[PDB]
Subunit: 287 residues, 2 copies
């Protein structure tokens, strides 16, 4: 049989590797059609973290995450033969993970989309608490339309199956997102710790989101993530909390930030460290 997110599991007798293989298209994964960059369905990078977390189970920690070329679906019927390769643990006990795809029909050359390592060490148990009704009493709520325009300004549009942001708050130094399972997406969930969309939603706000120079049309593509930890599956409703404004590297041209995942009570249960985006014009990005 076959997991909705990972596809088919194959354990390699020779190596002790594990391959998860599936055919990705809008039939299998209609949600991609609602994550549109330059009006092209594209899989956001954090999806591969989601997949890896689904393969190894939580609690888990994933480190040195890199995104190469995006997996995009040019045409309505485009199928990409996709493979997530989970390597056999090394001497330090780390598991290397890599995600490749090639076009189904044409039988093209394999393109890599992601690499990362599963840490040999379970993250240490979450320490940061938060009083949630107090945060929403010292911040100032956002109109979601204001955010939609910012995304549209960098050629990003979130369709019905990506609209997971219930409410947004902003301060001068901090930001907070209230995140839930989009009604359109609900049917597609399959007991994976965190769906690609939900982890993507965590990355949608920073104290200084009005700063991300808009007037060019050029997209900010996720490029690397230092560390991502998750202690348990996401609840039906949770929060994404950013404590400091994004760090802007100039000479190497990247914006980076941190996100704390907080449950219903305001208890931390996951985090994303060093979430880095880089400018990617459509000529370079779309391949």
């Amino acid at each position: 049989q076959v997991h909705r997110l990972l596809g088919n599991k194959l354990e390699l007798a020779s190596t002790g590797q594990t391959i998860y293989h599936q055919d990705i298209n809008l039939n299998n994964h209609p949600w991609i059609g609602d994550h549109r960059v330059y009006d092209t369905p594209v899989i956001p990078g954090v999806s591969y973290i989601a997949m890896t977390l689904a393969a190894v189970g939580v609690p888990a920690a994933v480190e040195d995450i890199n995104f190469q070329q995006p997996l995009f679906l040019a045409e309505s019927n485009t199928t990409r033969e996709t493979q997530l390769m989970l390597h056999t643990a090394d001497n330090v006990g780390k598991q290397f993970v890599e995600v490749f795809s090639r076009d189904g029909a044409k039988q093209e050359e394999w393109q890599q989309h992601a690499s990362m390592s599963v840490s040999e060490n379970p993250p240490p148990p979450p320490t940061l608490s938060v009083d949630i009704p107090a945060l929403c009493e010292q911040l100032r709520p956002l109109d979601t339309d204001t955010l939609t325009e910012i995304y549209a300004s960098i050629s990003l549009v979130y369709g019905p199956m990506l609209q997971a942001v219930r409410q947004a708050w902003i301060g001068e130094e901090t930001s907070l997102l209230e995140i839930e399972v989009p009604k359109a997406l609900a049917f597609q969930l399959a007991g994976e710790p965190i769906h690609p969309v939900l982890i993507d939603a965590c990355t949608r706000l920073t104290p200084d989101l009005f700063d991300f120079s808009s007037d060019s049309g050029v997209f900010w593509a996720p490029w690397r993530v230092k560390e991502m930890t998750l202690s348990h599956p996401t609840p039906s409703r949770f929060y994404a909390y950013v404590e400091e404004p994004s760090r802007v590297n100039e000479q190497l041209q990247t914006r980076s930030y941190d996100i704390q995942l907080l449950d219903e009570t305001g208890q931390a249960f996951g985090r994303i460290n060093g979430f880095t985006v880089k400018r990617a014009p459509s000529q370079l990005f779309l391949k």
Copy 2:
């Protein structure tokens, strides 16, 4: 899904190919007709047939080794099997491994075979034999006589393994006429050579009586130096052995060579250094 190889998966990362399938009496009823110690077992040469099906003929396969056999203990036993075709190396040879594990118990993987696909295939056959002229100077042999020898090493060929139409024997040479068993016919699927047919080529040598029929202990295929095949087997062909089996007292082995000859008597394949070794039931089926 190819009936013989199962499902093909090409690895993105390495350029390797995995053929994976569930082996059982349902998928492969013929195994039930190759019984050693009254246990359905896959003959070693099957994995050569599999490899030949993966890469195509003409082809040569070298340094073939058989480890633990794949056997089906119970009538419903399923073993998930994987044939791994490695990406070609510097010399351009492709390493091949066959593993299985129990479908139910999810035990540890057991290896059944390893071999290398040669960088370059055999040259188009030129040499040829006159079959009737060879048969005019060989003593025909009754099949019952052979069935008894196999039974004495705890080997029994059922209807789907009964590929030997006729057998001849001389002092120095042996000859087998081989055809597709009527019970097996429907299972063939365009593979160059079916496990059964390659197995049948190994069933006679000029000195077959000198195989110890005394304790019921089986002679298990252990290694093969080279196996070459130029084209798919015709519906009827011959297996020719030119010299008596070489016996290694010390290593406890018997080894021999088999020439595969078509309907006209033209050679189109061979098996070199086909080695059997004594394998008692306690060691063999465990």
